[PDB]
Amino acid sequence: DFLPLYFGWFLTKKSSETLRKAGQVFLEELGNHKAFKKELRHFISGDEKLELVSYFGKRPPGVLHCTTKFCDYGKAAGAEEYAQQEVVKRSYGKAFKLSISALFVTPKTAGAQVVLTDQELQLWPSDLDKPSASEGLPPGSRAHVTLGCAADVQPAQTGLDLLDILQQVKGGSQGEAVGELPRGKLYSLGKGRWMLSLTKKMEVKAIFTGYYG
Ligand SMILES: Nc1ncnc2c1ncn2[C@@H]1O[C@H](COP(=O)(O)O)[C@@H](O)[C@H]1OP(=O)(O)O
């Protein structure tokens, strides 16, 4: 039995649509915000204003998801080990609620930050080789829903972008709200990194299962 392309929490139609809409609204608001317009030179090398919805042109089609373990049908290291865990097998097909704490944007990716519960964290892989960007941060910090990518950006970048943002927030808690959007306060972590910290945690319903391409 070969494995999925990856395991993860696949948002329901309703949840996906709601989160997708919130993301689109955020990109729109952020692109119209003066704090962002002034900092456009740290975001692109090209010279007006930038519609971020077109900037993040590569978007997931259909239902949004929060990936746990990328398996590539068993070719990814640790894939077999992850899939054979009892909690994975037991949780397969089960419904969960994911807590979205923030939306974020970088020159590469737009996404939503997922804060996993302890129960859900048991489904988070503990692999042998880690990205060093996760050092000193709690397990599962990388948890995210990808909303969009710049044209030449590759997958798994959104997870990396998020960790880079979070290891800015831990060291400095960096920003007083440069703006106050209606869903929360807006942070500018420099270098084209933006974060909307939601006053209000968004809850999305999802199913833990495997995607097979
Ligand atoms: N090396 C990888 N490591 C972790 N996740 C990956 C990797 N490659 C692809 N993915 C993740 O699997 C999902 C589908 O990827 P793909 O479209 O290439 O098949 C995406 O959520 C992507 O994460 P991400 O959302 O951060 O890009």
Residue numbers in the entry: 163 to 209, 213 to 378
Publication passage describing the model:
2′,3′-cyclic nucleotide 3′-phosphodiesterase (CNPase) comprises 4% of total myelin protein in the central nervous system (CNS), being the most abundant CNS non-compact myelin protein4. CNPase consists of an N-terminal polynucleotide kinase-like domain10, a catalytic phosphodiesterase domain11, and a membrane-anchored C-terminal tail, which contains a cysteine residue that undergoes isoprenylation. The catalytic domain enables the rapid hydrolysis of nucleoside 2′,3′-cyclic phosphates to nucleoside 2′-phosphates. The CNPase catalytic site, lying in a groove between two lobes, has pseudo two-fold symmetry and contains two apposing His-X-Thr-X (X denotes a hydrophobic residue) motifs, characteristic for 2H phosphoesterases 113537.
We previously determined a V321A structure in complex with 2′-AMP34, in which the β5-α7 loop was open. While we have also obtained structures with an open β5-α7 loop from other mutants and the wild-type protein in complex with products, this has been particularly easy with V321A. This could relate to a higher binding affinity for the product, which would result in enzyme inhibition via hindered product release, and may explain the increased KM value. To further investigate the relevance of ligand size, we crystallized V321A in the presence of adenosine 2′,5′-bisphosphate (2′,5′-ADP), which, in addition to the 2′-phosphate, also contains a 5′-phosphate, thus mimicking the first 5′-phosphate of an RNA molecule. We obtained structures in the space groups P21 and P212121, and both structures allowed us to analyze the ligand orientation in its entirety. Similarly to V321A in complex with 2′-AMP34, the 2′,5′-ADP complexes show the β5-α7 loop the in the open conformation, with direct interactions between the 2´-phosphate and the N terminus of helix α7. The 5′-phosphate is visible and extends out of the active site towards bulk solvent. In an RNA oligonucleotide, the 5′-phosphate will be followed by another ribose and a base; several aromatic residues on the CNPase surface are in position to interact with these groups.
